[PDB]
Amino acid sequence: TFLPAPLQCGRFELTFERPLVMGILNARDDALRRAERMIAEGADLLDIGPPVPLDEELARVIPLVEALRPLNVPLSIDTYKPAVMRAALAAGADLINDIWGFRQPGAIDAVRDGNSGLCAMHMLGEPQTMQVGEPDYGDVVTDVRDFLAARAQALRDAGVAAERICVDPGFGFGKAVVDDNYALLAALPDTAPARPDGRAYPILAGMSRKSMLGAVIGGKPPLERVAASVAAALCAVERGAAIVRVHDVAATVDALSVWNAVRAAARQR
């Protein structure tokens, strides 16, 4: 029992007495009721996710935000495009999830206003071309914390209050598949830099169905990684995570219901 710092996130003041589950959502009706299921399954947030023409990315994301606004659960956007961020916030999205660390030109300007939650992810890459890079680290843990601290500073320098910001070590983006990813999972609480109050920024962790998983289970396909994905989530929560982003929602909630019983009893002594 440690408590991750709260996250102001749009409509919702989110507090982490228990860690929360982000269901990954990504036909428009197909996905309307796919989200009613996720909520019923125990999802506490919904992650609305070549690449795509702005014309298109907008057609497929903006209706979904308005379609699901009234369900009243935190709605999160997986985008690095400022135009996408600008639009989605206006349509009432609660949290922006950006692989690029709010580095694309304009990104910080598009989100410095309002109450939305912001999660800055670590990734090794050249923002200009959007080419993901090859690993290169001193201590990968020091390096990821260092990077994310610079990004929390950048956001705060443009008016963003410390408490709207959570961070993400970016399993799978520029990391040696096992050596770097598991180093970060093993050291998870040490990957978040300090808020001005001294508390660490809450951490979001997304490992679901990822390569780091398939590499330790003799190479199973992305859809054959459920129990592996659950396991990574528990390890992450056992080590500090505030939120875990997953495709397999009910399994993850079941697991975390066991973990919370355990912690509830370690506290009763």
Automatic annotation (TrEMBL):
Cofactor: Mg(2+)
GO-annotated molecular function: dihydropteroate synthase activity; metal ion binding
GO annotations of cellular component type: cytosol
Record keywords, A-Z: Folate biosynthesis, Magnesium, Metal-binding, Transferase
InterPro entries: DHP_synth-like, DHP_synth_dom, Dihydropteroate_synth-like_sf, Pterin-binding_dom
Stretches assigned to the Pterin-binding domain: 19-257
E.C. number: 2.5.1.15
Catalytic reaction equation(s): (7,8-dihydropterin-6-yl)methyl diphosphate + 4-aminobenzoate = 7,8-dihydropteroate + diphosphate
Pathway: Cofactor biosynthesis; tetrahydrofolate biosynthesis; 7,8-dihydrofolate from 2-amino-4-hydroxy-6-hydroxymethyl-7,8-dihydropteridine diphosphate and 4-aminobenzoate: step 1/2
GO BP annotations listed: folic acid biosynthetic process; tetrahydrofolate biosynthetic process
Keyword Transferase: yes
PANTHER family: FOLATE SYNTHESIS PROTEINS, FOLIC ACID SYNTHESIS PROTEIN FOL1
Family: Belongs to the DHPS family.
Function, in words: Catalyzes the condensation of para-aminobenzoate (pABA) with 6-hydroxymethyl-7,8-dihydropterin diphosphate (DHPt-PP) to form 7,8-dihydropteroate (H2Pte), the immediate precursor of folate derivatives.
Protein name: Dihydropteroate synthase
Species: Burkholderia cenocepacia (strain ATCC BAA-245 / DSM 16553 / LMG 16656 / NCTC 13227 / J2315 / CF5610)
Organism taxonomic ancestry: Bacteria, Pseudomonadati, Pseudomonadota, Betaproteobacteria, Burkholderiales
